[PDB]
Amino acid sequence: SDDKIGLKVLYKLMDVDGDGKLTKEEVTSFFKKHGIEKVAEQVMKADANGDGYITLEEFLEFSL
């Protein structure tokens, strides 16, 4: 649960783009208000793939 209960909550609430995945553009867009900065860094290191997004599946996969 705590694995990403909240992170997911907010995230799921964040994903406004229109897909369900937590992408940078979409992130910085919505996070632009939050800590897009600190988030940008964390997100940048989060992706650790190339330039994708954080999907519920990937979000739970990373927690697992």
> Which residues are known binding-site members for Ca(2+)?
15, 17, 19, 21, 26, 47, 49, 51, 53, 58
Q: Tell me the β-bridge partners of 53.
A: 23
Residue set of the binding site = 15, 17, 19, 21, 26, 47, 49, 51, 53, 58
What residue has token string 């609430």?
Answer: 13
Q: How far is the CB of 63 from La ion (least distance, A)?
A: 19
Q: Identify which of 6, 40, 1, 10 has the alpha carbon closest to the alpha carbon of residue 23.
A: 40
19 binds La ion (CB under 5 A): yes
Distance CA 46, CA 3 (A): 15
Rounded to a whole number of angstroms, the minimum distance from the CB of residue 18 to La ion is 6
